[PDB]
């Protein structure tokens, strides 16, 4: 009857996928509220309680036509990328601890993808809502093993051929699906899946967290045009900018940008730029403004660092 609730989604950025090579534990997929001195994990919840229930989650794709992503959500109850959690009774809120995303290679995409589609179609997981619109009957049928015959294999495998071509290995999305018990006591009732927001690999050169590590100087003349060195975290040469801004009382406008070129970003970790003119060059007492790394793309920004402008 009821539904699922993404309660607390995943942090969406800052997480770094891992290849099988990294092996050992390397963390737990954070919650969109984790803040070190308090950390969480993507929590889900149902409403019209159904006593006990099984909620499986798989990684889908961030495309208009939600599909299965090759990466494997490896964790605890996970196996083949379908972490299955048994929503305890009365408490319809079971969270997903340290999950961890597994990064498939660009070569193992169709190879790994076959299995994902093969499976589910077997284990009764999501009705060709990810694979194709010709199935929909990958739930339970009644009893057996669901070998879907050697025929149907042609759609799956060929479906693994056009998806593996556009698949993006840099971003994923959780797909929470709930199963409520039935007459047999088994869990056959498919509750409309709810995809998560969208998680971006941090390993990717443009989804990583921006940070200003060092600046040889954090003060300049209101005139501006004073060279500065900013040591940073991997930033994409032609998609980064230095923003100077101020909390103006009459609203809160005024923003300035360092003047540099991609040719001034030393090997994705340093930026040499010139400082912008400050608003009131008529100032007699210096004013404290801010600096901030910002991605021209998504416009994500670093924690702002102080900068003090003094008169000419």
């Amino acid at each position: 009857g009821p539904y699922l609730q993404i309660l607390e989604q995943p942090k969406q950025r800052g997480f770094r996928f891992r290849y099988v090579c990294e092996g050992p534990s390397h963390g737990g997929l954070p919650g969109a509220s984790s803040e070190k001195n308090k950390k969480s994990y993507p929590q889900v919840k149902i409403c019209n309680y159904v006593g006990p229930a099984k909620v499986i989650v798989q990684l889908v794709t961030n495309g208009k036509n939600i599909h299965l992503h090759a990466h494997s959500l490896v964790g605890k109850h996970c196996e083949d990328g379908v972490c299955t959690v048994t929503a305890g009774p009365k408490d319809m809120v079971v969270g997903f601890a340290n999950l961890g995303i597994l990064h498939v290679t660009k070569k193992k995409v169709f190879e790994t993808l076959e299995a994902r589609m093969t499976e589910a179609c077997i284990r009764g997981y999501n009705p060709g809502l990810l694979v194709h619109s010709d199935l929909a009957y990958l739930q339970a049928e009644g009893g057996g093993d669901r070998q879907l015959t050697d025929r149907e294999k042609e759609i799956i495998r060929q479906a693994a051929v056009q998806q593996t071509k556009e698949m993006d290995l840099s971003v994923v999305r959780l797909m929470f699906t709930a199963f409520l018990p039935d007459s047999t006591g088994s869990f056959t009732r498919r509750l409309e899946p709810v995809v998560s927001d969208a998680i971006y690999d941090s390993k990717a050169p443009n989804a990583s967290n921006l940070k200003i590590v060092r600046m040889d100087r954090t003060a300049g003349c209101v005139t501006g045009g004073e060279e500065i060195y900013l040591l940073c975290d991997k930033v994409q040469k032609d998609d980064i900018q230095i923003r100077f801004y101020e909390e103006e009382e009459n609203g809160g406008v005024w923003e300035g940008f360092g003047d540099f070129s991609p040719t001034d970003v030393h090997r994705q970790f340093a930026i040499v730029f010139k400082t912008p003119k400050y608003k009131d060059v008529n100032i007699t007492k210096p004013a404290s403004v801010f600096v901030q790394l910002r991605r021209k793309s998504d416009l994500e920004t670093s924690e702002p660092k102080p900068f003090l402008y003094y008169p000419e």
């Binding site: 040889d216 060279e227 060195y229 090997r267 994705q268």
Partner: protein
């Protein structure tokens, strides 16, 4: 019948390319090579001049010069070594078609294991030595050059290794460069913090060397001050004269302890007081 390289291959600067890597991409640069004039390796057979075969191959750097793993694909180059007839009209025969296919550790055992199963060994080095640890960032070229005899038989002439050649990618075989610095001057008292942007360097193994006639010192800085091995934040070293009185433009360069290599020079004017 005798031989000596006229144009010694390049030293520390080139970069080892791969198979997957851009093929037909580049070649092998010579000694006095240039950004406007190349000049590949050419061996001059002083005196004797006529028909002759040539099999060029790459070998390790040290004493028992075993055949090196890396191939050397390019024109006529086979199984790894090079081979083709030499102009039977001129003497000093050149080679513009050589590429150095560095191999992966993965396929190494195999790689050297080819050298033998394919007979490759300019110094008939024993097979029991044709294995074990090999250095992949340093190699030498050999010239197993054969010609005729005083009459008309297969008079093979003695091989000779070409100066060292090093992988540029290897962060400790690479060319130590100094791309740009913020400060350019400082007080004889020393201590002027400087930001030095530079090419990939290994913090555990790198120094900032200040030369200058009768003066020698290095910039103080710890490892934690080497950012993503492409920037260093060191403090300028005290000049010899605690009370200078005019610009004494000295020289500053990146130095690598291990290799004992020194980056190009960059000037740093030491002003007074």
């Amino acid at each position: 019948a005798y031989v000596e390289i006229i144009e010694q291959p390049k030293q520390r600067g080139m970069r080892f390319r791969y198979k997957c890597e851009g093929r037909s991409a580049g070649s092998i640069p010579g000694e006095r090579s240039t950004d406007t004039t190349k000049t590949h390796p050419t061996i001059k057979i002083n005196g004797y001049t006529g028909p002759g075969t040539v099999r060029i191959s790459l070998v390790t750097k040290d004493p028992p010069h075993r055949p090196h793993p890396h191939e050397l694909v390019g024109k006529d180059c086979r199984d790894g070594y090079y081979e083709a007839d030499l102009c039977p009209d001129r003497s000093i025969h050149s080679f513009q078609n050589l590429g150095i296919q560095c191999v992966k550790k993965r396929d190494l055992e195999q790689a050297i294991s080819q050298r033998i199963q394919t007979n490759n060994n300019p110094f008939h080095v024993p097979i029991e030595e044709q294995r074990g640890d090999y250095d992949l960032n340093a190699v030498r070229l050999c010239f197993q050059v054969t010609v005729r005899d005083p009459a008309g038989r297969p008079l093979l002439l003695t091989p000779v290794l070409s100066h060292p050649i090093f992988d540029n990618r290897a962060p400790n075989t690479a060319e130590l460069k100094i791309c740009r610095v913020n400060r350019n001057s400082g007080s004889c008292l020393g201590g002027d913090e400087i930001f030095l942007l530079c090419d990939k360097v290994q913090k555990e193994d790198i120094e900032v060397y200040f030369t200058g006639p009768g003066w020698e010192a290095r910039g103080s800085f710890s490892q934690a001050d080497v950012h993503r091995q492409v920037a260093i934040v060191f403090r300028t070293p005290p000049y010899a004269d605690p009370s200078l009185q005019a610009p004494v433009r000295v020289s500053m360069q990146l130095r690598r302890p291990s290799d004992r290599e020194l980056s190009e020079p960059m000037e740093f004017q030491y002003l007074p007081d």
